Design a protein around this ligand. Structure first.
Ligand SMILES: [Cu+]
Ligand SMILES: [Cu+]
Ligand SMILES: [Zn+2]
Ligand SMILES: [Zn+2]
Lengths: 153, 153
């Protein structure tokens, strides 16, 4: 697809709509939208492997990692395909997301279509935390809201 | 994908979980699960083009129709790829779903992954209604519940 979208919902107040657009079938993917109800500051933001919401965000599984690498920040060569880093919420609890990434795609082997977008409780340490958890989840904490990434127009 | 799942939700009591499994990429897809909160009787069941829930089921667009054909029953040669017919709710408002279809697929250029599964208010006349609306939606009425089809473990 050339456009995708995910509606974020959780058990708390966190909610929002994130759009994805890929101009060329292989080019970078632009990610933008608004998320409200968040605490001010950094919040982990990743694409998880499964688009399964049968048990809330918990059933989405781990980070989308088709190349079986360690967790990292989006700028790192060593990272999960789904590692989009952090998004920042302002004093009013709003995160006006604006990310561009060349690793995720809306088609092919690294396609995030049908997978789950998740926004976390805490900041993602981008794999620089020094413990095993950092190399897996970035120590971003619980999943506050998530949504299945679907094809859009 | 080999497995997929859709969690149906709407503005009313209608909700459910529908599983998808395709043993081989060129094989048929098994669809099964249950939906509750329905009025006894037949209810339209189709895959709509967009996995866009920004406006609830309303933003899902029309029936997935990559081959540009007229609406029909799942067993009709002439039909939308997304046409899965009707599910049947019992006296307790529960419809137990068990279907096998060889038109829809969970992979390939025309995969239903990332699109929307919708359950309708009324019965799908399978495109035999005799009117123009029948050849489009099958007169299935409003969209009671829907969910984005996501990749499952
Ligand atoms: Cu995550
Ligand atoms: Cu439909
Ligand atoms: Zn990761
Ligand atoms: Zn149709």
């Amino acid at each position: 697809a050339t456009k995708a979208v995910a509606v974020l919902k959780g058990d708390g107040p966190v909610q929002g709509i994130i759009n994805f657009e890929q101009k060329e079938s292989n080019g970078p993917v632009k990610v933008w939208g608004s998320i409200k109800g968040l605490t001010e500051g950094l919040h982990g933001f990743h694409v998880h492997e499964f688009g399964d919401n049968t048990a809330g965000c918990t059933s989405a599984g781990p980070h989308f990692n088709p190349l079986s690498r360690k967790h990292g920040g989006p700028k790192d060569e060593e990272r999960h395909v789904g590692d989009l880093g952090n998004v920042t919420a302002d004093k009013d609890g709003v995160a006006d997301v604006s990310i561009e990434d060349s690793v995720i795609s809306l088609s092919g082997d690294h396609s995030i279509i049908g997978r789950t977008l998740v926004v976390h409780e805490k900041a993602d340490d981008l794999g620089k935390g020094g413990n095993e958890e950092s190399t897996k989840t970035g120590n971003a904490g619980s999943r506050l809201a998530c949504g299945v990434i679907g094809i859009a127009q």
